[PDB]
Symmetry: C4
Subunit: 391 residues, 4 copies
């Protein structure tokens, strides 16, 4: 009596009917019942119920029945144990906190990492490797984005902005830059019109941040025809809009893998970012106050102002110094010049190293896990599902 | 004879009675005795004693009986093995040092991470999410703490401290800052009085560092009425007391999780902090002496003073340079200017990188373990104890 | 019926013939067939097939048959499991992505880490420890390479380049340096001729980068006889060729182990290098643009130029500052001087720390694995293959 | 025939006599022989040999017999497997390189971490906690070492070295410093004489570096009586000897644990230190040459000297800049000022980060392992060897 033998994959597990009967509703509980013989695969010759499952983990499942705490066996992958306890009826949200982080790891990484001529029209936006025209158009858009960025960076230069003797006198940009900008705008407008030709699910097309960036970047040049008092303000904000013209590089870099992994890492490590920002804000505030007060101890009594010989004339300046010093950057534009100031400075450097090295390793481990998983899923050749499951 | 078969969870373990008899007082030892049959669950049909326990770890327990050294099986969580050996009677302080740190890990992290209208009065200090009035009062205290801190930081500024032509002539602060400070003091005194209304266990309320900070921060303004020769000294120390007014931000940030984890990490990594401070002190002293002597080799014989062309006129200046250089901060206010000085400087930079990267990774690993455990225990939904233990 | 017992190394595994029959072509599939008895080692007494293999992993192989997903048992080394599944017929490219990176790890590291007087002639290029003459010649070439490098570094100095009153007036190098260079060239030409005497597989000898470096380094001196208008250009490029004379140190350092491990790490971490370069390029571009525009907000309206008080007169200067600031180098030649500029600067420092600490740990882990494996394979004494395999 | 059943700890392992017979000389080989029955514990009832050992690892030992490669089971501590294979007769130097580093880890860390009134005389040098007089004398020597160090550091100061109007005119040190030095010398000489009173194994006492440092530090003061032409040279070298007076702090810090762990780490990581020094030397040389040549591209043709506007007037200056820049120190005393120089500078910063982060993590992991093991062995309470081994 009350002696039941479970045969799992050829390994006989023995236990009392009470231990099975503890956790109700689960399959083993139904086993403990008196009418189990009829319902299950039970042979009267050996008085053992036979289950065709991995025995090495059924040990741990039955252990959950015995003691009362479910743990993850550290010798099997999380998904294997997940599938086994799913079969046995155990809820996965019961595992002890000692095992939860190792267990729910692959599934977290996986979850985070996850009209006739219209195909030919849309073939200019598909992946470059998906065709030959696609790769050609991709190379061309790469060339033109790079040309736009170089024109921008050279337009801000002095050599290309001489000031003419024209009378108000201001520097003017060379015509060649404006011509190259016009060419790039013509090409980008052609691409944008071709991509507007076919726009399925136009709501998501407008919600697509890349097309938003494209349109905002192409707005300032096109506004040359549209553009006197309001015109000055709109030109002033048009410079700020043009400022985004460097953001067209994400159009090219979106097809990279490391960047998608970085996006997933950022989106999945919000808590650690908030933690880092809070740590830095507290450190900056405290050390700015401390250095501002330390540097006033040695202030000369002659000068009317409280601080004349110190860079730390107030606390916000302390904020700047504290950031530069905690990140071990150390420009040297402002540094302590009093023994008290030097003590506070040494404390700031050490505390900065520590409170920067606290959450950054968490973020780095997240990126490492996501990058390894993405590189694996990329490397692994497409499978043909060799295992034909039985009916 | 001397052949005993232990049946643990359906797996038959065989061993000699002598091996069991080695370690006395334990349950298996009692098994080895001649009257075990009567006391234990022994069936004469198979001459095997039956224990309803995990067999995969009973292997390792019996191994401790056999060889004489207790180890932790690396395929089970520390708590699972802890509970198993606790059942078998093995003392947990016997495990070999090769296994102690992996074993006693979760339990270390866990240990470190651990009248009618009076409920409505006290509801202003409970958690914000615990009510609606609570969250409102929390937002209001947040606004007022931030306003106090901004008033402080702007009060130390020059733009808000013009010097009037009043005759002694000193800069005076604008009235608007004093008015905002008065408002914030009124609000904080109202909060403090409401929280004094109900003060259970007043000894711990006074021992509560947060209320201490609150009272010390509210003392200087209230002392305006209380406050001639002693008055100058008390004002001088009152500025230093006001210096703490930035510490009211911990009142808000105490409810954050990362900060509690950081507090536990600090309190649990005292040894590594002392190690870091000793390493830095030795490095600073040695390299200050070395650079001070190196920079004198090339001293010009003309100048009467020993050092005129070097920033390293003495050793304490060496302390400052050595800290700035070992933390890879490198302000550039003082740097070596002699080939010997440059050799010593390169040695200082490398030795600083090394003796800073020695203990900091230990501290970082501590924080990582505590943060993962705290985030797990926060994420895991409240359990309902599905396992109804048998009587 | 449909009940088959597999005996693997004395452990009886039981399963249905259907589960074996799922995955076809594999050995167990052939077992499931009706004529298995004749073909395999089957004894009718126990109706069990006997396989002389590790049972602890046959559990996981049969689990692949049962569920349909192949995993790596985390309690056995990758090569052990590799050999077991190779025996059983399972393809190794079926393991789940959760296990692929741990599994295919040692094999990745291993793959990356992998006429009578002519022996006496060639003995001057073999390993130094391979003979006594070899070690002597190696020491001599070490001395002469070091002498060449020191002559170069002193030749570029001022103390050794006085300007004589000879009439055009230019500084000339001392004769002693030219004599030492001549001596070193004589020795290197003797070595190179002796090594040309015996040159098996001359195609790979010319493809050998070390000999290429040797010949390019020995070309400029020998060109003294060969060398008026073209002569000036060839001397100008000859200085640039001489620039390589420091590269002869790799001839000596090639026999070091850490350097070969570093070469293998570099060649095996191309993807992470491209990732680091893309991250740095995006960060540099974005932050250069941001700081250039931030620093113009506070520009004084008096000056005709857009920026007079800021170091950030254009964007490329921003590139330089952004690199120096993201690597936490912080020279201090250029730094923000406007509250907006300081905000952008703090963002640059933090983003640089983060996007530098993203891929560098991946690269560091690669080097650590390769270095541990190389040091192991070096330390382990040469084996004598104690296991005489059975026929 | 050729079917042998090994019973290890109640688990029946089955294999062919040939597989056992492969590896000769080992215990299992002797089992395979025809006269094994008489020699071993064999019962004819079940035709199984019984061994009272852990079965979970005998699986892997028999696997070595089967396949031919010995691996470490990743689910047992290295010492447990070591003892098991030691019992079975397997040589420990056979494990595959995939397992060698995990296996030989604890044993590496452990190996690296390892007349009547004469007891009362020597009690002044024993551990402080070993008595009360011992702790008192230790505190007193601490006070006096600290006083000596402070006297030294203040003696090098300007405030304590005024120059008197005595006629040659040089600064002289105050008498109070000389008096304090005399007091400290009296105390140290008393300690040294008391410790010379009892000097067992005087060869090792003289080889003891601490006593060497003590005697060298006490020599200069005592030489006041001993000390005209040679006297100036001996005073000049006496200043350099006094330079060691800061080394008396190791006398106190030797009893610390972290410092002994650091000493063991250094002594056990010589290879990685040599690797770091070689990496830094190659980087410094290459980047010094590169920056010196890059900065000359933009040299103005007017100046007679090759370089007038650049800090990089020669290559050794390049060595200094390259160290300061690769360690991300960045003083700012010298920095590139040409677009080519800036390119080379960015390369130097990145290459420095990389080739510094290559071996330093290896060294850091060594220190972490040694520190964890030492802290464990310190924490663990003294055992009483509960396991009374059987005869
Ligand atoms: C100001 C500079 C800050 C950057 C602004 C935001 C950059 C950005 O949004 O880039 C996103 C692309 C990914 O683009 P995607 O999401 O994979 O493809 C389009 C599909 N939609 C968007 C319609 C769902 O690329 C990325 O994921 C990069 C993420 C972070 C880059 C820094
Ligand atoms: C901790 C919380 C951080 C919050 C900091 C937010 C500050 C936002 C500023 C609001 C606008 C201020 C303003 O309008 O002007 C006030 C003055 C301007 O003064 P300025 O003349 O432009 O400053 C030049 C500094 N020199 C070089 C002359 C010494 O301002 C100044 O005098 C200098 C302002 C200093 C601000 C430096 C911010 C540094 C970043 C801190 C961020 C850390 C968070 C992580
Ligand atoms: C001068 C600046 C240095 C900081 C002074 C100390 C700051 C501090 O004490 O903050 C503590 C709070 C935690 O507050 P708590 O302990 O969780 O809540 C109150 C319960 N008592 C205190 C009664 C047991 O918050 C923290 O735990 C922060 C710990 C470290 C913050 C830096
Ligand atoms: C190793 C052990 C570290 C212990 C160091 C404790 C020092 C405590 C100081 C005690 C009080 C000293 C005093 O009263 O005045 C003495 C002088 C003051 O001289 P000062 O005029 O104020 O210094 C200005 C420096 N200029 C810029 C001119 C070059 O002082 C000076 O000349 C400069 C003092 C330099 C102190 C810098 C301390 C740097 C932090 C070291 C901490 C490392 C620990 C980790
Ligand atoms: C300009 C400076 C950049 C360095 C230029 C390239 C340096 C180099 O090529 O060194 C290679 C040697 C290894 O030499 P090796 O490959 O082992 O031996 C000769 C066999 N061959 C080449 C014929 C196949 O040494 C190395 O592997 C060092 C690799 C990286 C060193 C930095
Ligand atoms: C992001 C993508 C990075 C690509 C950057 C490539 C730049 C290649 C330069 C092409 C040739 C430029 C040229 O011929 O001359 C144009 C001017 C020269 O001006 P200069 O007088 O020689 O600069 C001196 C700077 N002072 C000190 C006066 C302020 O040039 C200048 O005004 C200064 C040029 C600044 C270049 C600094 C490069 C910093 C490295 C960035 C690399 C990061 C990649 C990781
Ligand atoms: C010039 C500064 C460089 C330091 C010079 C060497 C310092 C030193 O030797 O300190 C050693 C002590 C350990 O002293 P100990 O070895 O444990 O005790 C005496 C037993 N003997 C030595 C007789 C075997 O303390 C240490 O182990 C510290 C090791 C490294 C400290 C830096
Ligand atoms: C790579 C291999 C590294 C080996 C380097 C060993 C150098 C040893 C020096 C030998 C003695 C040199 C000598 O006697 O004098 C020659 C000159 C002295 O010139 P100085 O006037 O004293 O230098 C002052 C520099 N100012 C500030 C003026 C620009 O010397 C000079 O002009 C400046 C010498 C620059 C030496 C700086 C060494 C930086 C450390 C490199 C170590 C890296 C290894 C890791
Ligand atoms: K740094
Ligand atoms: K720095
Ligand atoms: K600097
Ligand atoms: K710096
Ligand atoms: Zn898996
Ligand atoms: Zn657990
Ligand atoms: Zn292995
Ligand atoms: Zn162990």
């Amino acid at each position: 009596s009350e002696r039941i033998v479970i045969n799992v994959g050829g390994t006989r597990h023995q236990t009392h009917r009470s231990t099975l009967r503890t956790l109700p509703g689960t399959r083993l509980a139904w086993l403990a019942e008196p009418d189990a013989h009829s319902h299950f695969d039970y042979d009267p010759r050996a008085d053992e119920f036979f289950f065709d499952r991995h025995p090495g983990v059924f040990a741990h499942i039955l252990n959950y029945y015995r003691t009362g705490k479910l743990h993850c066996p550290a010798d099997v992958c999380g998904p294997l144990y997940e599938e086994e306890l799913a079969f046995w009826g155990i809820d996965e949200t019961d595992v002890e906190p000692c095992c939860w982080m190792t267990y729910r790891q692959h599934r977290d990484a996986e979850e985070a990492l996850d009209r006739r001529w219209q195909p030919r029209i849309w073939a200019l936006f598909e992946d470059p490797y998906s065709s030959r025209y696609a790769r050609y158009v991709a190379f061309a858009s790469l060339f033109f984005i790079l040309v736009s960025i170089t024109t921008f960076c050279l337009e801000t230069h002095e050599r290309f902005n001489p000031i003419v003797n024209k009378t108000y006198r201001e520097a003017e940009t060379e015509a060649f830059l404006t011509y190259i900008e016009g060419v790039c705008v013509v090409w980008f407008t052609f691409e944008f019109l071709m991509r507007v030709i076919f726009c399925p699910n136009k709501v998501e097309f407008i919600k697509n941040s890349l097309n938003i960036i494209d349109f905002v970047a192409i707005l300032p040049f096109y506004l040359e025809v549209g553009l006197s008092k309001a015109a000055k303000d709109v030109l002033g904000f048009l410079r700020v809009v043009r400022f985004v013209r460097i953001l067209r590089i994400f159009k090219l870099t979106r097809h990279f893998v490391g960047l998608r992994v970085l996006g997933h890492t950022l989106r999945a490590s919000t808590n650690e970012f908030l933690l880092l920002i809070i740590f830095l804000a507290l450190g900056v505030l405290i050390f700015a106050t401390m250095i501002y007060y330390a540097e006033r101890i040695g202030a000369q009594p002659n000068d009317p102002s409280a601080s004349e010989h110190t860079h730390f004339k107030n606390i916000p300046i302390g904020f700047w110094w504290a950031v530069v010093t905690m990140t071990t950057l150390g420009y040297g534009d402002m540094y302590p010049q009093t023994w008290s100031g030097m003590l506070v400075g040494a404390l700031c450097a050490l505390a900065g190293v520590l409170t920067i090295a606290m959450p950054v390793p968490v973020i780095v481990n997240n990126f490492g896990m996501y990058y390894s998983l993405a590189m694996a899923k990329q490397k692994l050749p497409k499978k043909k599902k060799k295992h034909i499951p039985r009916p």
